[PDB]
Amino acid sequence: SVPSQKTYQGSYGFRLGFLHSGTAKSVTCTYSPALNKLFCQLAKTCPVQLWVDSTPPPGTRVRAMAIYKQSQHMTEVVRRCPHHERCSDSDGLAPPQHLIRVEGNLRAEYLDDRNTFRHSVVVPCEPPEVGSDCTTIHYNYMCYSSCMGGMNRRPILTIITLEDSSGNLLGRDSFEVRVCACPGRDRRTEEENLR
Ligand SMILES: CNCc1ccc2c(c1)c1ccccc1n2CCF
Ligand SMILES: [Zn+2]
Known part of the structure; x- marks a missing residue:
């Protein structure tokens, strides 16, 4: 009904990493460690690093899924809006x-x-x-x-999620995402609000 979001390094020491892209007005993707939140422009490249302490077996896979952060919406499937699902x-x-x-x-x-x-x-x-x-x-x-x-x-x-060849859980990490026109400004604003 609701996928788990519990951080779990597992046997292979799995965790994510993010570049240090700054908050200039021109930035298209930037990650806030203080908020654990990625800010990015629509349809722009978001580099996400995968780190392990030891090599997982052949056939291991990496899955990404979005969920709503607020509990009153978490059962609703995250999908593209009625415009973007039709924009070819x-x-x-x-x-x-x-x-x-x-x-x-x-x-x-x-x-x-x-x-x-x-x-x-x-x-x-x-x-x-x-x-x-x-x-x-x-x-x-x-x-x-x-x-x-x-x-x-x-x-x-x-x-x-890091998964074995059957889809069983090997590791899990997560981050909030805001898709917006000005990621650098929005990261600066939200980090100020937090402080
Ligand atoms: C020093 N470098 C460590 C490192 C970091 C990430 C790594 C590996 C090794 C590694 C080895 C085999 C298969 C996938 C691997 N990943 C991607 C999944 F995190
Ligand atoms: Zn849309």
Whole structure:
């Protein structure tokens, strides 16, 4: 009915990482550690790092799913709004209803859950390239937080799960997301409000 959001490093020490992009007016994606919140523009690249302490088995996958943050909305499926689901911006793989896409990975799979109706996108867990210490997934968020008939100004969380080949839980992390026109200004405002 509601997916768990409990942080769980599991046997492999799984956790996320984010770049340090700053808050200039021109920034298109920026992460606030103090808020555990990603601020991004519509349909722009959001780099999310995956870190582990030890190598998970072949066939491990990484899934992303959005849920509403507020308890009174958590049972409602997060989906694109009535405008964006019809705007013919398909990448040829993501269903037009899905808020979260993975960019540039032909092995991405998109799930409409047959029981919960929730959307998710899952990719194989790949090791870092030679010379790198982590792997990065590039996500896109395909509606604004403010879209009427969709998120409608309600905050969302993204839950990232590390899964075995059967879909069993190996690790979990999460972060709040705001999709907005000016991520740098909004991050500065919300960090000031918190302080
Ligand atoms: C020093 N570098 C550690 C590190 C960081 C991230 C890593 C790995 C190793 C690793 C090894 C095998 C398969 C996937 C792997 N990931 C991605 C999932 F977090
Ligand atoms: Zn929309």
